[PDB]
Amino acid sequence: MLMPRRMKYRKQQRGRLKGATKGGDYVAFGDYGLVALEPAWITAQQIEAARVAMVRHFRRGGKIFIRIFPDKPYTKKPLEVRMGKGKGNVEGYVAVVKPGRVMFEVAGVTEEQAMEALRIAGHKLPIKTKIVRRDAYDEAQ
Amino acid sequence: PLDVALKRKYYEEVRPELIRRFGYQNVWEVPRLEKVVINQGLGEAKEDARILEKAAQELALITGQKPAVTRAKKSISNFKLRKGMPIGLRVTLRRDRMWIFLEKLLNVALPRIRDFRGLNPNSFDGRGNYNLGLREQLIFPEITYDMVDALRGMDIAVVTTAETDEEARALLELLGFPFRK
Amino acid sequence: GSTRNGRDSQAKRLGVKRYEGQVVRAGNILVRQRGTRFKPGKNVGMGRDFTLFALVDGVVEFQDRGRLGRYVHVRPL
Amino acid sequence: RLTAYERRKFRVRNRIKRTGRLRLSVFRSLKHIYAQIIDDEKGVTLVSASSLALKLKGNKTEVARQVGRALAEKALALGIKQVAFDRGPYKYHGRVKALAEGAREGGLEF
Amino acid sequence: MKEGIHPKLVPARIICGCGNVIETYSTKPEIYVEVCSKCHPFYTGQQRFVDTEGRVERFQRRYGDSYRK
Amino acid sequence: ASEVRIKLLLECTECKRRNYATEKNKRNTPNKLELRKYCPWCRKHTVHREVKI
RNA sequence: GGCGCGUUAACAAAGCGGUAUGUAGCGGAUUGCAAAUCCGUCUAGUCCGGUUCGACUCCGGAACGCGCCUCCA
RNA sequence: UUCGGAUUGGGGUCUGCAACCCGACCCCAUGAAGCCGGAAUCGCUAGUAAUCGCGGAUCAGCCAUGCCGCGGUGAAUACG
RNA sequence: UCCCCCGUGCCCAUAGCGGCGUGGAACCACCCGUUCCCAUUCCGAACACGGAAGUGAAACGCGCCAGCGCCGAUGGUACUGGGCGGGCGACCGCCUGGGAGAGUAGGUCGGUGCGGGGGA
RNA sequence: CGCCUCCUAAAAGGUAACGGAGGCGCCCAAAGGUCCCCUCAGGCGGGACGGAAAUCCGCCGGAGAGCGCAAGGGUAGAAGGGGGCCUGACUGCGAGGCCUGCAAGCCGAGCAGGGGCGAAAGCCGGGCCUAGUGAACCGGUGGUCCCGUGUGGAAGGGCCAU
RNA sequence: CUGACUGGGGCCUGUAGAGCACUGAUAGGGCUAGGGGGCCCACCAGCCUACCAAACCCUGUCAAACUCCGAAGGGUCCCAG
Ligand SMILES: [K+]
Ligand SMILES: [K+]
Ligand SMILES: [K+]
Ligand SMILES: [K+]
Ligand SMILES: [K+]
Ligand SMILES: [Mg+2]
Ligand SMILES: [Mg+2]
Ligand SMILES: [Mg+2]
Ligand SMILES: [Mg+2]
Ligand SMILES: [Mg+2]
Ligand SMILES: [Mg+2]
Ligand SMILES: [Mg+2]
Ligand SMILES: [Mg+2]
Ligand SMILES: [Mg+2]
Ligand SMILES: [Mg+2]
Ligand SMILES: [Mg+2]
Ligand SMILES: [Mg+2]
Ligand SMILES: [Mg+2]
Ligand SMILES: [Mg+2]
Ligand SMILES: [Mg+2]
Ligand SMILES: [Mg+2]
Ligand SMILES: [Mg+2]
Ligand SMILES: [Mg+2]
Ligand SMILES: [Mg+2]
Ligand SMILES: [Mg+2]
Ligand SMILES: [Mg+2]
Ligand SMILES: [Mg+2]
Ligand SMILES: [Mg+2]
Ligand SMILES: [Mg+2]
Ligand SMILES: [Mg+2]
Ligand SMILES: [Mg+2]
Ligand SMILES: [Mg+2]
Ligand SMILES: [Mg+2]
Ligand SMILES: [Mg+2]
Ligand SMILES: [Mg+2]
Ligand SMILES: [Mg+2]
Ligand SMILES: [Mg+2]
Ligand SMILES: [Mg+2]
Ligand SMILES: [Mg+2]
Ligand SMILES: [Mg+2]
Ligand SMILES: [Mg+2]
Ligand SMILES: [Mg+2]
Ligand SMILES: [Mg+2]
Ligand SMILES: [Mg+2]
Ligand SMILES: [Mg+2]
Ligand SMILES: [Mg+2]
Ligand SMILES: [Mg+2]
Ligand SMILES: [Mg+2]
Ligand SMILES: [Mg+2]
Ligand SMILES: [Mg+2]
Ligand SMILES: [Mg+2]
Ligand SMILES: [Mg+2]
Ligand SMILES: [Mg+2]
Ligand SMILES: [Mg+2]
Ligand SMILES: [Mg+2]
Ligand SMILES: [Mg+2]
Ligand SMILES: [Mg+2]
Ligand SMILES: [Mg+2]
Ligand SMILES: [Mg+2]
Ligand SMILES: [Mg+2]
Ligand SMILES: [Mg+2]
Ligand SMILES: [Mg+2]
Ligand SMILES: [Mg+2]
Ligand SMILES: [Mg+2]
Ligand SMILES: [Mg+2]
Ligand SMILES: [Mg+2]
Ligand SMILES: [Mg+2]
Ligand SMILES: [Mg+2]
Ligand SMILES: [Mg+2]
Ligand SMILES: [Mg+2]
Ligand SMILES: [Mg+2]
Ligand SMILES: [Mg+2]
Ligand SMILES: [Mg+2]
Ligand SMILES: [Mg+2]
Ligand SMILES: [Mg+2]
Ligand SMILES: [Mg+2]
Ligand SMILES: [Mg+2]
Ligand SMILES: [Mg+2]
Ligand SMILES: [Mg+2]
Ligand SMILES: [Mg+2]
Ligand SMILES: [Mg+2]
Ligand SMILES: [Mg+2]
Ligand SMILES: [Mg+2]
Ligand SMILES: [Mg+2]
Ligand SMILES: [Mg+2]
Ligand SMILES: [Mg+2]
Ligand SMILES: [Mg+2]
Ligand SMILES: [Mg+2]
Ligand SMILES: [Mg+2]
Ligand SMILES: [Mg+2]
Ligand SMILES: [Mg+2]
Ligand SMILES: [Mg+2]
Ligand SMILES: [Mg+2]
Ligand SMILES: [Mg+2]
Ligand SMILES: [Mg+2]
Ligand SMILES: [Mg+2]
Ligand SMILES: [Mg+2]
Ligand SMILES: [Mg+2]
Ligand SMILES: [Mg+2]
Ligand SMILES: [Mg+2]
Ligand SMILES: [Mg+2]
Ligand SMILES: [Mg+2]
Ligand SMILES: [Mg+2]
Ligand SMILES: [Zn+2]
Ligand SMILES: [Zn+2]
């Protein structure tokens, strides 16, 4: 499971999920990528669930690129406590993902293997996704 | 200016040979001798003794110039030393005093070193300077065994106008620096 | 938490007090700042807390000199 | 990068220009000595004197004293009395000091 | 040159055991040494000291050979 | 101020009047402070000396 | 969950911004031999991150252990 | 230390078919610990202790500072 | 009015780093000395003075070079003042006015004022 | 639970929560004034003991160092490092402003007296700056000689300093 | 006639966005100070790594308490309705 090794600040404010993706919008490392279609907080558990599913489906071969990282701390108050008395404790980490962001790539596999592995990985994620392949537009960037 | 033989020899036998070997078109291109800096990193006079006075007197006799005190720039526990305490001496020799000291070094100091086999040819700075390190102080002519109380060494910095080691090497061997093969 | 945090200090109301083209009297405070964000130009003095004040009556003028800094001048009438 | 010479020149002259007077600027080469009277507000030179133009030859300290007299004599005909002496990178001593006394002896207020 | 803190240098001679006389300026007007640059073995080419046989550690003795070949 | 950093009065040595109040560290500066200050009573500069507050 | 405290070597247990102890263990002495006794010797600061010239020691976090509180309904 | 003579480098002699593991001796160089020894423990009552040298068996040679003998110089103390 | 040099400004890298070439008649510098004024927590290195044997080697000035650095459009987009809508929500569209940052083409090895010395 | 710094705070100022992070209740007789001089951290190479790291030499290095203590702003064309002489860490004021419900808080040219440093121009009414603090009442100590209960004194008050 | 509001002109600002020059975070690869083992060998060092990892180079990202940048707006003064 991913998380930053060091942090300047333990807790962050809940920001905003506005706008299309800032960076990471084109396939850059692999041959087939999974692209987000709507914004969400993607937790570290969901990232690992998707990665392991591709590893199992890629028996022997395959190399997987994870292009998102959960750097944002996620906070929760303990059960049965009232409002107030400070911000809740850190319970996990999420990655802020906006539409157009390429989340995963794969390489070293056939086309059939890539489409099935990325399809299963998407079922582990809380958002609608699409599968893309590297094209001239990605190389033009 | 005092008629030192070493300065006389540099202008008579060394300069004409140097231009022959390297083909300088300017009389100021040929390497000159800039200064000699003698440093004594005592380190034992931090707080256990004010024995800087004994070394200052000995250094002044060897070079004719009273040396200056150098102080610690910071505190280090592993050396048990505090910032600002005196841990060395340094003297700078230029012009006639520079020539006089090197003549004694090449003639009456270096031959008195135990098991002398020549100077290190790989100690050239890489930009035309030389540095050598001494372990003994009684090899100098003005030092006798009677007034020697503790053994002390020094570092000698020889600074030249030469740009490269090969040109600084040529000046030093002709001047009289003997080097190991 | 609600025990570790909870402190702040009063706001200081810093910034430029008179802008370019305004008419000022001698002694008028022109800039409140921490350090020399703006530098004292012609007919401008600096107090011990980097406050810029006018030395004569006149018109405020601002100037940017690149690497030399930003200056505030007072041009007399 | 700046040298001790360049830092010294800036440090002395920034103090002078703060006062808003006319600055008496002195340049001292290995051979000669030169003096200008400068109005920084307009950036123009009002009067200038030197040992090169006057063909003064002798002891440099003696030469500089006569350059100060000539600059002072030139200055008063143009209605200037009050100036500020700008030593630049030079210590107030020797040739630069001799020019200042010569200017003061000629009737300059500084 | 500051005054009162530097030992004044005077013309001086350094006499070696081999009779060599080097003329210089020093704080002592007469010095005697036991070795100089004109008699030290490393300077006079080789001046082979008590060790001059190259250690002869190889088979350069031939150790007889009166035994059968 | 503290036990080591104390408050003190400066007293004119010519008319004996206390004209200034200030402080010092008595471990760093064990001896009495002596300074030249304007005395408004004497209307000139005189030596002032430290006295107890 | 709140608040307070503690973590030291073989065990029990102290002081210290720069330097234990008791009983053991080990080598010797004594003894027919073991114990007792005597002569010598000896193993360290829970972990991570800071401040500091310098941390077992001061500060922050984590883990474990201990003590008290958790009421009106 | 002109005390002390371990350790090591080098040159040699002899015995033995053969001195590397593993002999003795000579010469040169090297010149360690050791400043009278903690708790404790041993021998000895007179030609004894202490101290000095000499011979023998085994044995080519010898790791003998051991063992068995021989003589030279020669004490102190025993109240109980 | 032309050119070279010296001093002092302004604009504040399109002005800089780096590479190559060049200047001693004049100026400037290095340079020669340390008696004198002055000076080094030691040193005439620095600061200072007295000069003219030498050299433009170093420094400085002046030229060429787009390797780096800096400047940088047009077009399009993000965002947005105001006016309207959609979506369970996270959020998203349309009209009207404004409009980046990055990237691209490309530009740049400065411009200019005053004074002084010299030559044409 | 008062005070200082940053964020939240929506590009003037201001802005809440038992919102997110840290500090203060000192200090310095120089760590103050002025004049003069000087310029870092780091990296690479060389050098007796001597090293990751002591002191010395050469080269590159524009601020990544330093500035007593949190954070931010500022800063080498010094506010940083060193030295000489000094006490302006002044008295009497104070045009004009910032800030502001009040009360507080903050900056300040210039004039007079008497000075410090500097050849001079000039600077100096503490400290690179923003925390290091407490109204009034009651009382203590020094000065002043204003009041002094018929009168001269005194007791005791006032005023100025603390 | 000075007002809300509006027009023109100057100055002030660091949000939205964006970016990686600083401070932190961070994915893949290359090159390697130093690590784990290793053919080992302590006489003495290189080398092996499909196990880490400093700087550096390429590619690719993140930030309320990051900024080489930076709007729309807003504030304020002057003149005009
Ligand atoms: K899904
Ligand atoms: K005054
Ligand atoms: K009107
Ligand atoms: K960055
Ligand atoms: K406006
Ligand atoms: Mg929220
Ligand atoms: Mg969010
Ligand atoms: Mg991008
Ligand atoms: Mg949450
Ligand atoms: Mg809460
Ligand atoms: Mg929460
Ligand atoms: Mg995204
Ligand atoms: Mg050189
Ligand atoms: Mg906090
Ligand atoms: Mg607090
Ligand atoms: Mg607040
Ligand atoms: Mg406030
Ligand atoms: Mg505030
Ligand atoms: Mg402002
Ligand atoms: Mg101040
Ligand atoms: Mg001046
Ligand atoms: Mg006072
Ligand atoms: Mg225990
Ligand atoms: Mg202990
Ligand atoms: Mg014990
Ligand atoms: Mg025991
Ligand atoms: Mg035992
Ligand atoms: Mg027993
Ligand atoms: Mg037993
Ligand atoms: Mg026992
Ligand atoms: Mg109740
Ligand atoms: Mg001996
Ligand atoms: Mg054998
Ligand atoms: Mg011993
Ligand atoms: Mg003895
Ligand atoms: Mg026994
Ligand atoms: Mg008997
Ligand atoms: Mg034996
Ligand atoms: Mg010029
Ligand atoms: Mg620019
Ligand atoms: Mg003299
Ligand atoms: Mg040149
Ligand atoms: Mg285009
Ligand atoms: Mg564009
Ligand atoms: Mg555009
Ligand atoms: Mg909008
Ligand atoms: Mg719009
Ligand atoms: Mg908006
Ligand atoms: Mg809008
Ligand atoms: Mg538009
Ligand atoms: Mg743009
Ligand atoms: Mg643009
Ligand atoms: Mg350029
Ligand atoms: Mg309160
Ligand atoms: Mg308070
Ligand atoms: Mg706003
Ligand atoms: Mg504003
Ligand atoms: Mg604001
Ligand atoms: Mg409110
Ligand atoms: Mg409310
Ligand atoms: Mg609370
Ligand atoms: Mg709050
Ligand atoms: Mg803080
Ligand atoms: Mg605190
Ligand atoms: Mg406080
Ligand atoms: Mg003090
Ligand atoms: Mg201070
Ligand atoms: Mg200061
Ligand atoms: Mg800094
Ligand atoms: Mg602190
Ligand atoms: Mg700061
Ligand atoms: Mg700085
Ligand atoms: Mg500088
Ligand atoms: Mg001072
Ligand atoms: Mg006074
Ligand atoms: Mg008020
Ligand atoms: Mg004033
Ligand atoms: Mg005065
Ligand atoms: Mg002050
Ligand atoms: Mg602040
Ligand atoms: Mg503060
Ligand atoms: Mg205070
Ligand atoms: Mg009351
Ligand atoms: Mg009262
Ligand atoms: Mg009272
Ligand atoms: Mg009284
Ligand atoms: Mg009455
Ligand atoms: Mg009466
Ligand atoms: Mg009376
Ligand atoms: Mg009274
Ligand atoms: Mg009274
Ligand atoms: Mg009173
Ligand atoms: Mg009062
Ligand atoms: Mg943003
Ligand atoms: Mg940007
Ligand atoms: Mg991150
Ligand atoms: Mg990497
Ligand atoms: Mg980003
Ligand atoms: Mg964001
Ligand atoms: Mg961003
Ligand atoms: Mg910030
Ligand atoms: Mg931002
Ligand atoms: Mg009107
Ligand atoms: Zn000789
Ligand atoms: Zn008085």
PDB file of C-alpha atoms in Angstrom, chain A:
ATOM      1  CA  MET A   1       0.000   0.000   0.000  1.00  0.00           C
ATOM      2  CA  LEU A   2       1.287   3.420  -0.992  1.00  0.00           C
ATOM      3  CA  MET A   3       1.707   6.436   1.290  1.00  0.00           C
ATOM      4  CA  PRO A   4       4.287   9.243   1.587  1.00  0.00           C
ATOM      5  CA  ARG A   5       7.356   8.404   3.644  1.00  0.00           C
ATOM      6  CA  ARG A   6       7.525  11.904   5.146  1.00  0.00           C
ATOM      7  CA  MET A   7       5.045  14.760   5.424  1.00  0.00           C
ATOM      8  CA  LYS A   8       5.446  18.406   6.352  1.00  0.00           C
ATOM      9  CA  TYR A   9       1.879  18.439   7.719  1.00  0.00           C
ATOM     10  CA  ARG A  10      -0.168  15.512   8.998  1.00  0.00           C
ATOM     11  CA  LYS A  11      -3.622  16.818   8.022  1.00  0.00           C
ATOM     12  CA  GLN A  12      -5.010  18.581   4.955  1.00  0.00           C
ATOM     13  CA  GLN A  13      -8.200  20.487   4.225  1.00  0.00           C
ATOM     14  CA  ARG A  14     -10.837  18.875   2.000  1.00  0.00           C
ATOM     15  CA  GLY A  15     -10.261  20.673  -1.272  1.00  0.00           C
ATOM     16  CA  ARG A  16     -12.358  20.797  -4.444  1.00  0.00           C
ATOM     17  CA  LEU A  17     -12.849  18.358  -7.338  1.00  0.00           C
ATOM     18  CA  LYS A  18     -13.202  20.990 -10.095  1.00  0.00           C
ATOM     19  CA  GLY A  19     -11.858  21.033 -13.628  1.00  0.00           C
ATOM     20  CA  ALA A  20     -10.209  18.582 -15.975  1.00  0.00           C
ATOM     21  CA  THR A  21      -6.887  16.969 -15.130  1.00  0.00           C
ATOM     22  CA  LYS A  22      -3.815  19.171 -14.781  1.00  0.00           C
ATOM     23  CA  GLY A  23      -1.036  16.759 -15.773  1.00  0.00           C
ATOM     24  CA  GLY A  24      -0.632  13.132 -16.768  1.00  0.00           C
ATOM     25  CA  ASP A  25      -3.199  13.246 -19.579  1.00  0.00           C
ATOM     26  CA  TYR A  26      -1.366  11.215 -22.257  1.00  0.00           C
ATOM     27  CA  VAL A  27       0.084   7.710 -22.394  1.00  0.00           C
ATOM     28  CA  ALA A  28       3.813   8.045 -21.757  1.00  0.00           C
ATOM     29  CA  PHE A  29       5.317   4.720 -20.603  1.00  0.00           C
ATOM     30  CA  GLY A  30       3.234   1.714 -21.673  1.00  0.00           C
ATOM     31  CA  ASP A  31       1.084   0.683 -24.616  1.00  0.00           C
ATOM     32  CA  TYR A  32      -2.415   0.658 -23.067  1.00  0.00           C
ATOM     33  CA  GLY A  33      -3.741   2.984 -20.392  1.00  0.00           C
ATOM     34  CA  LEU A  34      -6.788   3.374 -18.178  1.00  0.00           C
ATOM     35  CA  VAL A  35      -8.205   6.905 -18.139  1.00  0.00           C
ATOM     36  CA  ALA A  36     -10.535   8.426 -15.558  1.00  0.00           C
ATOM     37  CA  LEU A  37     -13.811   9.897 -16.810  1.00  0.00           C
ATOM     38  CA  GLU A  38     -15.098  11.561 -13.613  1.00  0.00           C
ATOM     39  CA  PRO A  39     -13.426  13.016 -10.510  1.00  0.00           C
ATOM     40  CA  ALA A  40     -12.936  11.144  -7.254  1.00  0.00           C
ATOM     41  CA  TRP A  41     -10.715  10.481  -4.284  1.00  0.00           C
ATOM     42  CA  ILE A  42      -9.007   7.181  -5.141  1.00  0.00           C
ATOM     43  CA  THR A  43      -7.885   5.441  -1.961  1.00  0.00           C
ATOM     44  CA  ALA A  44      -4.656   3.492  -1.539  1.00  0.00           C
ATOM     45  CA  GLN A  45      -6.670   0.291  -1.006  1.00  0.00           C
ATOM     46  CA  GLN A  46      -8.438   0.684  -4.356  1.00  0.00           C
ATOM     47  CA  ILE A  47      -5.112   1.317  -6.103  1.00  0.00           C
ATOM     48  CA  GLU A  48      -3.641  -1.887  -4.665  1.00  0.00           C
ATOM     49  CA  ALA A  49      -6.803  -3.849  -5.484  1.00  0.00           C
ATOM     50  CA  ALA A  50      -6.503  -2.796  -9.129  1.00  0.00           C
ATOM     51  CA  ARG A  51      -2.753  -3.494  -9.331  1.00  0.00           C
ATOM     52  CA  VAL A  52      -2.957  -7.012  -7.876  1.00  0.00           C
ATOM     53  CA  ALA A  53      -5.804  -7.889 -10.252  1.00  0.00           C
ATOM     54  CA  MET A  54      -3.598  -7.006 -13.228  1.00  0.00           C
ATOM     55  CA  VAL A  55      -0.652  -8.942 -11.755  1.00  0.00           C
ATOM     56  CA  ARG A  56      -2.744 -12.106 -11.424  1.00  0.00           C
ATOM     57  CA  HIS A  57      -4.173 -11.737 -14.933  1.00  0.00           C
ATOM     58  CA  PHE A  58      -0.682 -11.226 -16.453  1.00  0.00           C
ATOM     59  CA  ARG A  59       0.742 -14.667 -15.545  1.00  0.00           C
ATOM     60  CA  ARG A  60       4.519 -14.558 -16.171  1.00  0.00           C
ATOM     61  CA  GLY A  61       4.765 -11.500 -18.417  1.00  0.00           C
ATOM     62  CA  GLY A  62       3.731  -7.876 -18.218  1.00  0.00           C
ATOM     63  CA  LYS A  63       4.962  -4.635 -16.662  1.00  0.00           C
ATOM     64  CA  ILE A  64       2.553  -2.298 -14.869  1.00  0.00           C
ATOM     65  CA  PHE A  65       2.905   1.475 -14.491  1.00  0.00           C
ATOM     66  CA  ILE A  66       0.909   3.176 -11.737  1.00  0.00           C
ATOM     67  CA  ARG A  67       0.729   6.872 -12.626  1.00  0.00           C
ATOM     68  CA  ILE A  68      -1.152   8.114  -9.536  1.00  0.00           C
ATOM     69  CA  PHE A  69       0.032   8.348  -5.936  1.00  0.00           C
ATOM     70  CA  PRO A  70      -2.069   8.836  -2.776  1.00  0.00           C
ATOM     71  CA  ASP A  71      -0.385  11.832  -1.134  1.00  0.00           C
ATOM     72  CA  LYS A  72      -3.500  13.427   0.413  1.00  0.00           C
ATOM     73  CA  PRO A  73      -4.201  12.389   4.029  1.00  0.00           C
ATOM     74  CA  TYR A  74      -7.734  11.282   4.850  1.00  0.00           C
ATOM     75  CA  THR A  75      -9.226  11.968   8.272  1.00  0.00           C
ATOM     76  CA  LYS A  76     -12.084  10.422  10.245  1.00  0.00           C
ATOM     77  CA  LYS A  77     -13.583  11.018  13.672  1.00  0.00           C
ATOM     78  CA  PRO A  78     -14.027   8.031  16.010  1.00  0.00           C
ATOM     79  CA  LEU A  79     -17.458   6.468  16.325  1.00  0.00           C
ATOM     80  CA  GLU A  80     -19.899   7.959  18.858  1.00  0.00           C
ATOM     81  CA  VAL A  81     -18.171  11.340  19.224  1.00  0.00           C
ATOM     82  CA  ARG A  82     -19.887  14.695  18.826  1.00  0.00           C
ATOM     83  CA  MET A  83     -18.831  17.555  16.577  1.00  0.00           C
ATOM     84  CA  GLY A  84     -15.955  19.708  17.771  1.00  0.00           C
ATOM     85  CA  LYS A  85     -12.827  18.982  19.801  1.00  0.00           C
ATOM     86  CA  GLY A  86     -10.474  19.268  16.826  1.00  0.00           C
ATOM     87  CA  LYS A  87      -9.956  17.523  13.521  1.00  0.00           C
ATOM     88  CA  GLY A  88     -10.212  13.748  13.338  1.00  0.00           C
ATOM     89  CA  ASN A  89      -7.340  11.296  13.122  1.00  0.00           C
ATOM     90  CA  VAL A  90      -5.654  10.211   9.895  1.00  0.00           C
ATOM     91  CA  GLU A  91      -7.121   6.951   8.609  1.00  0.00           C
ATOM     92  CA  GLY A  92      -5.709   6.648   5.093  1.00  0.00           C
ATOM     93  CA  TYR A  93      -4.434   8.358   1.975  1.00  0.00           C
ATOM     94  CA  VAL A  94      -6.116   9.191  -1.327  1.00  0.00           C
ATOM     95  CA  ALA A  95      -5.075  10.422  -4.754  1.00  0.00           C
ATOM     96  CA  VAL A  96      -7.034  13.299  -6.272  1.00  0.00           C
ATOM     97  CA  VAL A  97      -8.029  12.191  -9.779  1.00  0.00           C
ATOM     98  CA  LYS A  98      -9.705  14.444 -12.344  1.00  0.00           C
ATOM     99  CA  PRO A  99     -11.220  13.592 -15.746  1.00  0.00           C
ATOM    100  CA  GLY A 100      -8.624  12.817 -18.396  1.00  0.00           C
ATOM    101  CA  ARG A 101      -6.030  11.477 -15.954  1.00  0.00           C
ATOM    102  CA  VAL A 102      -4.256   8.302 -17.066  1.00  0.00           C
ATOM    103  CA  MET A 103      -4.156   6.156 -13.928  1.00  0.00           C
ATOM    104  CA  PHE A 104      -2.449   2.930 -15.079  1.00  0.00           C
ATOM    105  CA  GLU A 105      -0.474   1.652 -18.049  1.00  0.00           C
ATOM    106  CA  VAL A 106       0.679  -1.800 -19.114  1.00  0.00           C
ATOM    107  CA  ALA A 107       3.393  -3.035 -21.459  1.00  0.00           C
ATOM    108  CA  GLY A 108       4.877  -6.295 -22.670  1.00  0.00           C
ATOM    109  CA  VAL A 109       1.493  -7.964 -23.219  1.00  0.00           C
ATOM    110  CA  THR A 110      -0.696  -8.694 -26.211  1.00  0.00           C
ATOM    111  CA  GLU A 111      -3.724  -6.557 -27.011  1.00  0.00           C
ATOM    112  CA  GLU A 112      -6.158  -9.182 -25.705  1.00  0.00           C
ATOM    113  CA  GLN A 113      -4.310  -9.483 -22.392  1.00  0.00           C
ATOM    114  CA  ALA A 114      -4.199  -5.707 -21.912  1.00  0.00           C
ATOM    115  CA  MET A 115      -7.913  -5.106 -22.510  1.00  0.00           C
ATOM    116  CA  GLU A 116      -9.008  -7.861 -20.121  1.00  0.00           C
ATOM    117  CA  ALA A 117      -6.594  -6.836 -17.356  1.00  0.00           C
ATOM    118  CA  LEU A 118      -7.553  -3.161 -17.549  1.00  0.00           C
ATOM    119  CA  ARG A 119     -11.263  -4.037 -17.641  1.00  0.00           C
ATOM    120  CA  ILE A 120     -10.971  -6.043 -14.411  1.00  0.00           C
ATOM    121  CA  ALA A 121      -8.913  -3.275 -12.790  1.00  0.00           C
ATOM    122  CA  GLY A 122     -11.643  -0.749 -13.580  1.00  0.00           C
ATOM    123  CA  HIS A 123     -14.199  -2.842 -11.689  1.00  0.00           C
ATOM    124  CA  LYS A 124     -12.090  -2.218  -8.566  1.00  0.00           C
ATOM    125  CA  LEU A 125     -12.391   1.578  -8.960  1.00  0.00           C
ATOM    126  CA  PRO A 126     -15.308   3.808  -7.884  1.00  0.00           C
ATOM    127  CA  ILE A 127     -15.467   5.761 -11.178  1.00  0.00           C
ATOM    128  CA  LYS A 128     -16.233   5.196 -14.832  1.00  0.00           C
ATOM    129  CA  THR A 129     -13.107   4.643 -16.924  1.00  0.00           C
ATOM    130  CA  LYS A 130     -12.110   3.909 -20.504  1.00  0.00           C
ATOM    131  CA  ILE A 131      -9.248   1.963 -22.067  1.00  0.00           C
ATOM    132  CA  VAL A 132      -6.951   3.808 -24.485  1.00  0.00           C
ATOM    133  CA  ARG A 133      -3.930   2.831 -26.555  1.00  0.00           C
ATOM    134  CA  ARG A 134      -0.889   4.965 -27.303  1.00  0.00           C
ATOM    135  CA  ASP A 135      -1.323   6.932 -30.524  1.00  0.00           C
ATOM    136  CA  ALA A 136       0.259   9.778 -32.474  1.00  0.00           C
ATOM    137  CA  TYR A 137      -1.350  12.343 -30.154  1.00  0.00           C
ATOM    138  CA  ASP A 138       0.501  10.930 -27.145  1.00  0.00           C
ATOM    139  CA  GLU A 139       3.796  11.012 -29.044  1.00  0.00           C
ATOM    140  CA  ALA A 140       3.077  14.568 -30.207  1.00  0.00           C
ATOM    141  CA  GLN A 141       2.978  15.821 -26.596  1.00  0.00           C
TER     142      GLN A 141
END
